[PDB]
Amino acid sequence: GIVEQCCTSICSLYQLENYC
Amino acid sequence: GIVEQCCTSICSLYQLENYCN
Amino acid sequence: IVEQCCTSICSLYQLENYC
Amino acid sequence: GIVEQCCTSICSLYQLENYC
Amino acid sequence: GIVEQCCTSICSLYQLENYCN
Amino acid sequence: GIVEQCCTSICSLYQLENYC
Amino acid sequence: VNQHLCGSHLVEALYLVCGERGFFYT
Amino acid sequence: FVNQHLCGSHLVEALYLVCGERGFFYTX
Amino acid sequence: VNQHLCGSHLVEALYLVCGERGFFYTXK
Amino acid sequence: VNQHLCGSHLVEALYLVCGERGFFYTX
Amino acid sequence: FVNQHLCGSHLVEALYLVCGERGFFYTX
Amino acid sequence: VNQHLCGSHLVEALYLVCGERGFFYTX
Numbered sequence: 288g289i290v291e292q293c294c295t296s297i298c299s300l301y302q303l304e305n306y307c
Numbered sequence: 308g309i310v311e312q313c314c315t316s317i318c319s320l321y322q323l324e325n326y327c328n
Numbered sequence: 329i330v331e332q333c334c335t336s337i338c339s340l341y342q343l344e345n346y347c
Numbered sequence: 348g349i350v351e352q353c354c355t356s357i358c359s360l361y362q363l364e365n366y367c
Numbered sequence: 368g369i370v371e372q373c374c375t376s377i378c379s380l381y382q383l384e385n386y387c388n
Numbered sequence: 389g390i391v392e393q394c395c396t397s398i399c400s401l402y403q404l405e406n407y408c
Numbered sequence: 409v410n411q412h413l414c415g416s417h418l419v420e421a422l423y424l425v426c427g428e429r430g431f432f433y434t
Numbered sequence: 435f436v437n438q439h440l441c442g443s444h445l446v447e448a449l450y451l452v453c454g455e456r457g458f459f460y461t462x
Numbered sequence: 463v464n465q466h467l468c469g470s471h472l473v474e475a476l477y478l479v480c481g482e483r484g485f486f487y488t489x490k
Numbered sequence: 491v492n493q494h495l496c497g498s499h500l501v502e503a504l505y506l507v508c509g510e511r512g513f514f515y516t517x
Numbered sequence: 518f519v520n521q522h523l524c525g526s527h528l529v530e531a532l533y534l535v536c537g538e539r540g541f542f543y544t545x
Numbered sequence: 546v547n548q549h550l551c552g553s554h555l556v557e558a559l560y561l562v563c564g565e566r567g568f569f570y571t572x
């Protein structure tokens with residue numbers, strides 16, 4: 288879902304941290 | 308300097324955030 | 329390589345042609 | 348092990364495929 | 368202005384040199 | 389060549405331009 | 409193929425942010 | 435080592451290309 | 463966003479071109 | 491400009507895949 | 518050092534991600 | 546392994562500098 292969430296709108300550091 | 312501190316030991320994002328602005 | 333791989337995703341075998 | 352194997356000696360694409 | 372100038376059309380090395388210091 | 393020259397000492401853009 | 413390119417930047421970002429925790433990509 | 439950290443960055447880029455649809459896991 | 467991606471390449475480019483002079487970057 | 495960015499990734503990919511054989515790149 | 522030059526390349530990418538809207542300055 | 550990493554940055558640099566002329570690379 289990261290591709291769906293972060294390749295359509297700029298994701299922040301906190302948002303990206305969900306995929307850690 | 309950033310090169311002196313972060314190219315000798317791994318700097319984190321928080322450490323690096325100091326060199327912003 | 330630009331024409332083939334920048335319009336559609338090229339595979340490893342496809343890219344190897346430009347080696 | 349990937350760091351130990353591929354950062355001490357050059358790993359190939361085939362070698363790297365093992366960690367997929 | 369670099370994003371506006373170089374992300375809409377390809378900037379050359381000389382164009383990029385304007386943002387050095 | 390380029391690996392010997394630019395991986396042992398920092399090459400400039402002009403230095404690198406020779407390998408084009 | 410823009411998504412494929414975006415993915416490359418995504419993994420680079422995850423690598424920095426996640427640190428010791430590591431991360432997953434699929 | 436800082437060198438291990440830099441290498442890891444290239445490793446993850448490589449895995450992204452090689453693994454394709456299968457995806458991958460990474461932990462330092 | 464495509465602009466965020468472009469910025470990443472621009473900053474890499476500035477780093478090489480500017481050399482010893484260094485450079486500044488701000489996404490405005 | 492999108493082509494220019496793709497080219498950057500393309501050249502990186504060729505570097506890994508081609509290995510010892512090396513590779514060529516032209517626009 | 519050549520290693521310093523390579524590390525710097527990763528550093529500016531990291532600053533680009535971390536600093537976001539604030540932007541940044543880099544000088545070797 | 547450091548040579549392998551430098552090569553990655555080298556080809557990226559060549560890609561930017563050489564432009565339309567293109568280039569050849571073989572480790």
Ligand SMILES: [Cl-]
Nearest residue numbers: 413467468495
């Ligand atoms: Cl991109």
Ligand SMILES: [Cl-]
Nearest residue numbers: 440523550551
């Ligand atoms: Cl490196």
Ligand SMILES: [Zn+2]
Nearest residue numbers: 413417467495
């Ligand atoms: Zn990119």
Ligand SMILES: [Zn+2]
Nearest residue numbers: 440523527550
């Ligand atoms: Zn590197």
